[PDB]
PDB file of C-alpha atoms in Angstrom:
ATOM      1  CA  UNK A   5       9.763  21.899  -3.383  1.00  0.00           C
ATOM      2  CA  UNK A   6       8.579  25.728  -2.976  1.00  0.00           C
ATOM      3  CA  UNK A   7       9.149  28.516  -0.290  1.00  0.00           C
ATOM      4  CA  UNK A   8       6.841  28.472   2.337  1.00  0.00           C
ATOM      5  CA  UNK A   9       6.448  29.726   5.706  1.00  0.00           C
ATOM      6  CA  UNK A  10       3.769  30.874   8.261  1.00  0.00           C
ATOM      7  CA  UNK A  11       3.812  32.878  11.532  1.00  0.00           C
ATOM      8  CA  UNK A  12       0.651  34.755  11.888  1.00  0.00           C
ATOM      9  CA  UNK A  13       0.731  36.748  15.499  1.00  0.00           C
ATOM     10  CA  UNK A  14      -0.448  35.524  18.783  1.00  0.00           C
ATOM     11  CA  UNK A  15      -4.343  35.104  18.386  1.00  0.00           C
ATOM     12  CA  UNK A  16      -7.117  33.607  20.632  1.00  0.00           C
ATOM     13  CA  UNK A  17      -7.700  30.166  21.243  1.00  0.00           C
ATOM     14  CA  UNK A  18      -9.998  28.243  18.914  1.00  0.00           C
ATOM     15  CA  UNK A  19     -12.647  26.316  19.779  1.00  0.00           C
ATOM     16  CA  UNK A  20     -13.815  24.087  16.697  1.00  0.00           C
ATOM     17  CA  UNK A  21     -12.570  20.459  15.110  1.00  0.00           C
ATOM     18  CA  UNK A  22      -9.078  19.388  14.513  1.00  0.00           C
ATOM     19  CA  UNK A  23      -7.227  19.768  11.663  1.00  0.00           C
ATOM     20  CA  UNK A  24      -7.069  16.825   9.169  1.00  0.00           C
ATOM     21  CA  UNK A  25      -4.664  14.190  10.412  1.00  0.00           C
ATOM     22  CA  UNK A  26      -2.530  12.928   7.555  1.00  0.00           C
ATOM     23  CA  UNK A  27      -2.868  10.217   5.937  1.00  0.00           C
ATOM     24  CA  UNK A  28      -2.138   6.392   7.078  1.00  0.00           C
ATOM     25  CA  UNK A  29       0.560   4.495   5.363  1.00  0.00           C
ATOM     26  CA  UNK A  30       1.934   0.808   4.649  1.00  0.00           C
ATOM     27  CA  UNK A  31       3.908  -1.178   6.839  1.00  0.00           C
ATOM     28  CA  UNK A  32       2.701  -4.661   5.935  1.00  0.00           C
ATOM     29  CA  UNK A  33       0.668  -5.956   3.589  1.00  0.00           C
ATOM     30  CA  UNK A  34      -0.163  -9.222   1.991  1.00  0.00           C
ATOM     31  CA  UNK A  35      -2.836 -11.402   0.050  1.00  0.00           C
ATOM     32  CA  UNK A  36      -4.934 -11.866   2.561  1.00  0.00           C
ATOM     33  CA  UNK A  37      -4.306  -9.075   5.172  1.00  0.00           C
ATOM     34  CA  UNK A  38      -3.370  -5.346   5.098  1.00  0.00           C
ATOM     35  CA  UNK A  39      -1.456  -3.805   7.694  1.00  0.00           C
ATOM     36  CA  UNK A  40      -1.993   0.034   8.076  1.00  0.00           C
ATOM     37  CA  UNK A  41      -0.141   2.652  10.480  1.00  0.00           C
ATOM     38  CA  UNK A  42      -0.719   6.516  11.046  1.00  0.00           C
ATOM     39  CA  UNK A  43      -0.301   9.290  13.774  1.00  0.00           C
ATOM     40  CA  UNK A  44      -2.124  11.395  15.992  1.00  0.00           C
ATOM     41  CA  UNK A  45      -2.976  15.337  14.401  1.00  0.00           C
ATOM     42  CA  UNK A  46      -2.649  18.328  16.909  1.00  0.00           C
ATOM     43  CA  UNK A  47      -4.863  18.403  19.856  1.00  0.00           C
ATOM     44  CA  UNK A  48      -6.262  21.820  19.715  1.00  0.00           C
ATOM     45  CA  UNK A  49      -9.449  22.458  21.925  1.00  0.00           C
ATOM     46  CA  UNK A  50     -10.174  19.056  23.358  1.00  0.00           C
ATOM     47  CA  UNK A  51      -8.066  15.805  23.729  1.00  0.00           C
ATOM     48  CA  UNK A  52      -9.729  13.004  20.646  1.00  0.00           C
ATOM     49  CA  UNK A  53     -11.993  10.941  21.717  1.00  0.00           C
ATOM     50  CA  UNK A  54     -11.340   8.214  19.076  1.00  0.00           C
ATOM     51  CA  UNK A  55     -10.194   7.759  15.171  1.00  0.00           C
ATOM     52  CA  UNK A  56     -12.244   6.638  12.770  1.00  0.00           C
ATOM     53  CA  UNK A  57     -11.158   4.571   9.841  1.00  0.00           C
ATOM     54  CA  UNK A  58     -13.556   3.766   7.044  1.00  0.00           C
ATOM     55  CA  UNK A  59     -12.570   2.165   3.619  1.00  0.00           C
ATOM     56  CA  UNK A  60     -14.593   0.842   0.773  1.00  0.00           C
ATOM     57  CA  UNK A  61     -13.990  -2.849   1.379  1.00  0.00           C
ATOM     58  CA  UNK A  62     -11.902  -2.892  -1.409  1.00  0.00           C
ATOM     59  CA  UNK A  63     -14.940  -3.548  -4.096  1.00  0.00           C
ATOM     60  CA  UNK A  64     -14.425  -0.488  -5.862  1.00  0.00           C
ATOM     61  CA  UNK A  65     -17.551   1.237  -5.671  1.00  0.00           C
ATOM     62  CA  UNK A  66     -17.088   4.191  -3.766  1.00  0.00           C
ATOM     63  CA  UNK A  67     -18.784   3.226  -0.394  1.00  0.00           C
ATOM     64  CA  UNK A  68     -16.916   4.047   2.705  1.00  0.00           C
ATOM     65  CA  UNK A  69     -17.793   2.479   5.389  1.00  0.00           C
ATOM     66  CA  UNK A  70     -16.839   2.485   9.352  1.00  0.00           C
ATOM     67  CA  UNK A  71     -13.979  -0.047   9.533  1.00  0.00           C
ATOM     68  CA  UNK A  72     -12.282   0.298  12.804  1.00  0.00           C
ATOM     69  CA  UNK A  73     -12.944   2.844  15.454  1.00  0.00           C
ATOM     70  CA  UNK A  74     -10.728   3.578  18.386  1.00  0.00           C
ATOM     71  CA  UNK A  75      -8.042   4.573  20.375  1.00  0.00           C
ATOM     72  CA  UNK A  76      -5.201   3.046  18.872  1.00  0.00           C
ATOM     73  CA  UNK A  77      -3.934   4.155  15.586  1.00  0.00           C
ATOM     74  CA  UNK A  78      -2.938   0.638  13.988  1.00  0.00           C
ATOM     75  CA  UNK A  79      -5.083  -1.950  12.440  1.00  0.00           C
ATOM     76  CA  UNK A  80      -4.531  -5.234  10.512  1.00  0.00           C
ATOM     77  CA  UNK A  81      -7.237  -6.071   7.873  1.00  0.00           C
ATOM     78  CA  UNK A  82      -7.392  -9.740   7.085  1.00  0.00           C
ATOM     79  CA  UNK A  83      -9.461 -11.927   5.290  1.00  0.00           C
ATOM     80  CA  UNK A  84      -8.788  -9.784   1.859  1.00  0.00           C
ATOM     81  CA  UNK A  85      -7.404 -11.167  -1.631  1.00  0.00           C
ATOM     82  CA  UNK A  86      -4.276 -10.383  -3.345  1.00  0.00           C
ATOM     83  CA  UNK A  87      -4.724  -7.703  -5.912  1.00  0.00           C
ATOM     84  CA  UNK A  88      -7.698  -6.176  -4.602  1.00  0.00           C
ATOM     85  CA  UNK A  89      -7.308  -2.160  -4.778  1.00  0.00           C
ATOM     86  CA  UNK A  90      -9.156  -0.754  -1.375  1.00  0.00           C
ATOM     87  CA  UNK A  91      -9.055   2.599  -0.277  1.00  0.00           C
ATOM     88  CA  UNK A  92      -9.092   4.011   3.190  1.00  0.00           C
ATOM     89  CA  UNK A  93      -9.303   7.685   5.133  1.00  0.00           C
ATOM     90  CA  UNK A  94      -7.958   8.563   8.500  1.00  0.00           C
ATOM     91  CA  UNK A  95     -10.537  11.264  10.720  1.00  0.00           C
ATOM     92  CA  UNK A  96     -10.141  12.822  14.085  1.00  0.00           C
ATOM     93  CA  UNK A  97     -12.870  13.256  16.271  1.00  0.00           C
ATOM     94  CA  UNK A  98     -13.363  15.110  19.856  1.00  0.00           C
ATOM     95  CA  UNK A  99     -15.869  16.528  22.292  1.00  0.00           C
ATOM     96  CA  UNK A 100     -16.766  18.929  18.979  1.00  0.00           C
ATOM     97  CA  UNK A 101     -16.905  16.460  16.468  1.00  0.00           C
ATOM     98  CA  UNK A 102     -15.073  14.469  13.738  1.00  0.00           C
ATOM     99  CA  UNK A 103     -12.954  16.517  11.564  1.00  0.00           C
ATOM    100  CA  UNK A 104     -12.237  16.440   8.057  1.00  0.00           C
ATOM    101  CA  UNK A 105     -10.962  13.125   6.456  1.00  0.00           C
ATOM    102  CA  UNK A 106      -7.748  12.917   5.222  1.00  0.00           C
ATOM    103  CA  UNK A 107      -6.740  12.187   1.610  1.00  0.00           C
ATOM    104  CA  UNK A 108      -7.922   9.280   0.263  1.00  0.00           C
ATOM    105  CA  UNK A 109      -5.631   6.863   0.272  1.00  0.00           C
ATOM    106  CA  UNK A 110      -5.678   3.641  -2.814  1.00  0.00           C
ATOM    107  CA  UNK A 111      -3.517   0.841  -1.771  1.00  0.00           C
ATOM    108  CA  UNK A 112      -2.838  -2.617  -3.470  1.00  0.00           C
ATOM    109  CA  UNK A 113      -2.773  -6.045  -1.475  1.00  0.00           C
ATOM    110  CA  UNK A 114       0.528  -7.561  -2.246  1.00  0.00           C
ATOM    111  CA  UNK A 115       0.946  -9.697  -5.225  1.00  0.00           C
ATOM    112  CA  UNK A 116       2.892  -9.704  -8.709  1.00  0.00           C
ATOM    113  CA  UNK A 117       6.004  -8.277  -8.948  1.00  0.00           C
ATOM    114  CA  UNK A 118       8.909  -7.477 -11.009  1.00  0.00           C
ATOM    115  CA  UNK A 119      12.347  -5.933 -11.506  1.00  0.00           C
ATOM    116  CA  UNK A 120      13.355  -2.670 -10.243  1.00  0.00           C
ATOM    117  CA  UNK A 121      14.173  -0.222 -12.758  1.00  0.00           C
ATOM    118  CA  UNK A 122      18.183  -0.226 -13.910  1.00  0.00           C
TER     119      UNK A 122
END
């Protein structure tokens, strides 16, 4: 952790792409399927048209490609193989246009495991 606050006063409105939304997370993954969930950034000039997920098919290359574009911010992958590392990005995108991609995320299709540390 580390002090940190903002409060810059009252300014115009901006006109210009969103700010990065962050980054989508785990909530169910398997061998053959990879469940991934995120939220919506802050609206600020014009409501988002769409999100737009890319990942690199899990080959490990480092070729994004369009994956699943739309309103809804939740989207099973299936047909994958267990241990088979595949990144993804989460990107905003209104009247303007789409704005920066998160941080890339690496995830791990479910598989071996062991004990938990103790």
């Amino acid at each position: 952790g580390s002090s940190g606050s903002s409060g810059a006063e009252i300014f115009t409105t901006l006109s210009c792409e969103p700010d990065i939304p962050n980054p989508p997370r785990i909530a169910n993954r398997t061998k053959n399927s990879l469940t991934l969930q995120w939220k919506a950034p802050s609206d600020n000039g014009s409501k988002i048209q769409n999100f737009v997920l890319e990942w690199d098919e899990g080959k490990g290359n480092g070729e994004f490609c369009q994956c699943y574009m739309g309103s809804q911010k939740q989207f099973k992958i299936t047909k994958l193989s267990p241990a088979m590392g595949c990144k993804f990005r989460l990107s905003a995108r209104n009247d303007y246009g789409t704005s920066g991609f998160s941080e890339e995320v690496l995830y791990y299709t479910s598989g071996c495991s062991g004990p938990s540390s103790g």
